[PDB]
Amino acid sequence: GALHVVIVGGGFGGIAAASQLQALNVPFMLVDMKDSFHHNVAALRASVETGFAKKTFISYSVTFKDNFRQGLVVGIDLKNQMVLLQGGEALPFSHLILATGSTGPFPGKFNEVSSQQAAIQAYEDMVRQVQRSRFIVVVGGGSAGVEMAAEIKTEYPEKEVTLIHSQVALADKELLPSVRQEVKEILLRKGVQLLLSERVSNLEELPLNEYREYIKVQTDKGTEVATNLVILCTGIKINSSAYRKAFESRLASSGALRVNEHLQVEGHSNVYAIGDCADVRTPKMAYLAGLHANIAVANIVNSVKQRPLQAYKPGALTFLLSMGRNDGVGQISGFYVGRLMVRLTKSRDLFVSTSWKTMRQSPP
Numbered sequence: 311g312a313l314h315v316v317i318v319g320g321g322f323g324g325i326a327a328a329s330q331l332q333a334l335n336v337p338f339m340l341v342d343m344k345d346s347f348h349h350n351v352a353a354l355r356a357s358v359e360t361g362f363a364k365k366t367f368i369s370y371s372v373t374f375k376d377n378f379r380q381g382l383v384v385g386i387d388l389k390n391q392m393v394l395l396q397g398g399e400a401l402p403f404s405h406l407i408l409a410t411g412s413t414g415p416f417p418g419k420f421n422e423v424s425s426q427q428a429a430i431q432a433y434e435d436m437v438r439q440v441q442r443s444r445f446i447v448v449v450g451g452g453s454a455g456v457e458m459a460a461e462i463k464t465e466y467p468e469k470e471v472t473l474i475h476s477q478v479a480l481a482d483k484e485l486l487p488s489v490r491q492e493v494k495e496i497l498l499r500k501g502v503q504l505l506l507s508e509r510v511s512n513l514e515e516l517p518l519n520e521y522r523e524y525i526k527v528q529t530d531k532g533t534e535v536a537t538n539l540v541i542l543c544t545g546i547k548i549n550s551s552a553y554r555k556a557f558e559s560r561l562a563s564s565g566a567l568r569v570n571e572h573l574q575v576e577g578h579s580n581v582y583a584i585g586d587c588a589d590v591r592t593p594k595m596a597y598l599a600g601l602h603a604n605i606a607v608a609n610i611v612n613s614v615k616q617r618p619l620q621a622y623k624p625g626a627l628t629f630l631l632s633m634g635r636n637d638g639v640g641q642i643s644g645f646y647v648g649r650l651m652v653r654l655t656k657s658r659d660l661f662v663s664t665s666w667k668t669m670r671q672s673p674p
């Protein structure tokens with residue numbers, strides 16, 4: 311019938327879709343459990359640079375006003391076509407965009423519901439923990455952990471940083487071998503110590519994000535590393551809380567929703583999945599969440615116009631690793647790119663400006 315879209319999740323995917331619909335004057339409601347969007351892509355820098363955290367949270371209210379509702383989605387009532395919020399509120403939808411992202415540990419993710427002031431302060435508190443600590447361990451040498459280790463060494467080149475990683479090679483396994491090698495070479499040039507093929511084994515006794523006189527980190531192999539600070543970069547998990555019951559039969563084992571070339575959820579013409587929660591065969595990226603949002607919004611419109619849907623054309627992997635504000639490496643459509651490009655394109659600003667642009671607000 312008449313258009314009234316509901317978007318579950320104000321992440322990179324959700325704010326792209328919401329600003330698009332808002333610009334098209336398409337009625338919609340954006341729902342998020344938090345009161346502001348988190349530019350998590352810069353949360354590592356927010357962990358090492360004083361006064362940076364305020365640049366990484368953007369209030370939904372200011373941008374979306376009455377098209378925003380803060381709330382915890384607890385289910386999808388498909389028979390009545392409504393989104394269900396904790397407390398009892400129900401939002402009817404003509405079309406549903408599921409953009410729930412994923413959960414993970416601080417600092418890389420901030421899934422907590424808290425005041426903007428507490429959220430910013432949690433990171434400020436993190437910057438002081440790092441500045442106190444002479445020895446620091448980063449657990450997990452995927453694409454998050456290598457940035458975290460590199461950020462620390464760049465801002466504080468006197469500190470002793472150890473990166474412990476259970477794989478033989480650093481960062482995403484889909485990356486070009488040349489890109490992974492240069493990630494390693496940059497870390498060593500910066501003086502980060504690498505413990506490869508080691509799994510930290512006593513995580514449940516380690517205080518995290520907290521300076522301490524003495525922290526004993528152990529590994530499967532029996533290595534022990536004494537440290538002042540431990541930071542977890544051990545990965546993220548698809549957040550399926552909003553839809554896992556109503557869509558149980560459509561979920562991949564990751565909890566992602568199976569989708570067709572049009573990003574329609576399997577079995578549905580008026581439900582779309584974008585961002586991390588969509589079952590696409592690619593590393594989880596804010597970059598791709600935005601691309602998914604274009605296609606979902608385009609295809610809601612296309613489908614009411616009764617026109618054929620657009621297909622997502624995946625191509626070769628594009629992926630940029632910032633290595634502190636002064637370095638980095640990555641690839642574009644499957645081809646290596648080096649320090650000057652990555653440092654100017656990602657490392658300097660970590661795409662922060664793009665989120666304020668989408669939100670139509672100016673950073674403090």
Ligand SMILES: Cc1cc2c(nc3c(=O)[nH]c(=O)nc-3n2C[C@H](O)[C@H](O)[C@H](O)COP(=O)(O)OP(=O)(O)OC[C@H]2O[C@@H](n3cnc4c(N)ncnc43)[C@H](O)[C@@H]2O)c(O)c1C
Nearest residue numbers: 319321322323343383410411418552585586594595596597
């Ligand atoms: C951990 C990490 C990830 C990076 C990083 N860097 C990059 C990068 O440079 N480039 C990139 O493209 N991706 C990068 N990524 C990946 C990127 O973070 C993810 O691909 C990206 O966040 C995906 O965006 P989505 O829109 O899919 O999801 P979000 O997590 O952004 O937003 C989800 C929202 O849904 C809301 N939500 C979920 N379930 C809900 C529910 N039941 N009720 C209400 N709200 C809910 C949540 O509160 C949350 O705000 C990085 O440095 C780190 C440390």
Ligand SMILES: NC(=O)c1ccc[n+]([C@@H]2O[C@H](COP(=O)([O-])OP(=O)(O)OC[C@H]3O[C@@H](n4cnc5c(N)ncnc54)[C@H](O)[C@@H]3O)[C@@H](O)[C@H]2O)c1
Nearest residue numbers: 450451452453454455474475476509510544545593594630
């Ligand atoms: N540049 C970018 O676009 C960018 C940056 C960061 C993250 N991401 C994406 O976000 C997602 C999450 O990335 P991530 O690096 O946070 O997680 P990840 O799962 O990609 O990497 C974490 C790594 O930690 C290792 N690990 C787990 N437990 C461990 C332990 N106890 N000791 C040692 N190592 C341990 C795991 O084997 C894993 O390889 C991925 O899809 C990634 O592509 C993208």
